[PDB]
């Protein structure tokens, strides 16, 4: 009796690790997308967005409004819900500038904060640059 045989070898199969994999906890980042669509004298309304990298369930947010140039003791910051993308600021002095600091609240605390300035007036103005 007798017989023979033969074959060939080979292999290959690349892959990639899945993103969005937070092992540890940590406060969120700065809320980007701070634009002022509606801004009046003593009443403004800006809109922001959540941080692509929350790295933690948002419990709420904070919007600090104050006069960039004025006097006082502190700034009356307001806490928003974790499902708040926009906010309304009432009781602002016209013919001035206000700094809007947006922040989120997690199980760790308050992470980065997005600062956005907005003037109070009826005359629309926007240089757009930088």
Curated annotation (Swiss-Prot):
Pinpoint the Fibronectin type-III domain residues: 30-124
Specify the domain of life of the species encoding this protein.
Answer: Eukaryota
Where in or outside the cell?
A: Cell membrane; Synapse
Record note on quaternary structure: Homodimer; mediates homophilic interactions to promote cell adhesion. Interacts (via PDZ-binding motif) with MAGI1, MAGI2, DLG2, DLG3 and DLG4.
Give a short account of what the protein does. Answer: Adhesion molecule that promotes lamina-specific synaptic connections in the retina and is specifically required for the formation of neuronal circuits that detect motion. Acts by promoting formation of synapses between two specific retinal cell types: the retinal ganglion cells W3B-RGCs and the excitatory amacrine cells VG3-ACs. Formation of synapses between these two cells plays a key role in detection of motion. Promotes synaptic connectivity via homophilic interactions.
Q: Which family does it belong to?
A: Belongs to the sidekick family.
In the record's own words, the domains note is:
The PDZ-binding motif mediates interaction with PDZ domain-containing proteins MAGI1, MAGI2, DLG2, DLG3 and DLG4 and is required for is required for synaptic localization in photoreceptors.
Q: What is this protein called?
A: Protein sidekick-2
This protein's species is: Homo sapiens
Q: Identify the coding gene.
A: SDK2
Instruction: Give from-to of the shown chain within the full protein.
Output: 1281 to 1397 of 2172
């Amino acid at each position: 009796g007798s017989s023979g045989s033969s074959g060939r070898i080979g292999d290959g199969s690349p892959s990639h690790p899945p993103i969005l994999e937070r092992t540890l906890d940590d406060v969120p980042g700065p809320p980007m997308g701070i634009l002022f669509p509606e801004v009046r004298t003593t009443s403004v309304r800006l809109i922001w967005q959540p941080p692509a990298a929350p790295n933690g369930i948002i419990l709420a947010y904070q919007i600090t409004h104050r006069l960039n140039t004025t006097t006082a003791n502190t700034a009356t910051v307001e806490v928003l819900a974790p499902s708040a993308r926009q906010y309304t600021a009432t009781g602002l002095k016209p013919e001035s500038v206000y700094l809007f600091r947006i922040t989120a609240q997690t199980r760790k605390g308050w992470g980065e904060a997005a600062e956005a300035l907005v003037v109070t007036t009826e005359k629309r103005s926007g240089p757009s640059s930088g």
